[PDB]
Design a protein around this motif. Structure first.
Motif, PDB file in Angstrom:
ATOM      1  N   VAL A   1       0.841  -1.184   0.000  1.00 21.81           N
ATOM      2  CA  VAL A   1       0.000   0.000   0.000  1.00 21.81           C
ATOM      3  C   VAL A   1       0.876   1.234   0.000  1.00 21.81           C
ATOM      4  N   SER A   2       2.143   1.034   0.340  1.00 19.76           N
ATOM      5  CA  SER A   2       3.111   2.111   0.390  1.00 19.76           C
ATOM      6  C   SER A   2       4.458   1.618  -0.109  1.00 19.76           C
ATOM      7  N   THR A   3       5.382   2.561  -0.217  1.00 17.29           N
ATOM      8  CA  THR A   3       6.745   2.252  -0.605  1.00 17.29           C
ATOM      9  C   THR A   3       7.499   1.594   0.539  1.00 17.29           C
ATOM     10  N   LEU A   4       7.963   0.375   0.303  1.00 18.17           N
ATOM     11  CA  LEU A   4       8.792  -0.335   1.263  1.00 18.17           C
ATOM     12  C   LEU A   4      10.233   0.098   1.041  1.00 18.17           C
ATOM     13  N   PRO A   6      13.794  -1.341   1.972  1.00 22.82           N
ATOM     14  CA  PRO A   6      15.144  -1.909   2.179  1.00 22.82           C
ATOM     15  C   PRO A   6      16.126  -1.713   1.026  1.00 22.82           C
ATOM     16  N   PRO A   7      16.378  -0.491   0.464  1.00 27.45           N
ATOM     17  CA  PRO A   7      17.633  -0.374  -0.299  1.00 27.45           C
ATOM     18  C   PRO A   7      18.770   0.318   0.438  1.00 27.45           C
TER      19      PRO A   7
END
Lengths: 85, 56
Positions: A1-4, A6-7
């Protein structure tokens, strides 16, 4: 639903991983090591250090001083022969 | 001009090769795929949203 995201979580990652210990070990292992056999002080003289330099380094390492020391005992008691018998 | 977004997304796909075990990031791209594939059929599916008072 949103930007995750882990970069970019390498900030508090770079303590926990296992080669971090090896990395921080050998950055400490590599700085104070003399470069190429430097500061060797290959000649020293204390009236017997030349005896070690000619006989007792890694290069010569032959049993001859033992031989010399063997002759030393041959030099020792035989004179005491001339003091005793 | 959506191809720049999707090109950088596949660039991050071949860069998210470097982090195996992506929880919901590809699922976030799945949600943008969901509504972007929905909106194009939504805009192509409709008529001119009006009662044709001339013929009809």
């Amino acid at each position: 639903v949103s930007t995750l995201i882990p970069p970019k979580v390498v900030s508090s990652k770079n303590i926990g991983s296992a080669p971090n210990a090896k990395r921080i070990a050998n950055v400490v292992h590599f700085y104070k090591s003399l470069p190429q056999g430097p500061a060797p002080a290959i000649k020293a003289n204390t009236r017997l250090a030349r005896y070690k330099a000619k006989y007792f380094d890694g290069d010569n390492a032959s049993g001859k001083p033992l031989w010399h020391f063997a002759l030393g005992i041959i030099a020792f008691g035989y004179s005491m022969e001339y003091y005793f018998h | 001009a959506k191809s720049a977004a999707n090109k950088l997304d596949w660039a991050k796909v071949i860069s998210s090769l470097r982090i195996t075990g992506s929880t919901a990031t590809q699922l976030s791209s799945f949600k943008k795929r969901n509504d972007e594939a929905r909106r194009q059929l939504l805009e192509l599916q409709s008529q001119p949203t009006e009662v044709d008072f001339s013929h009809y």
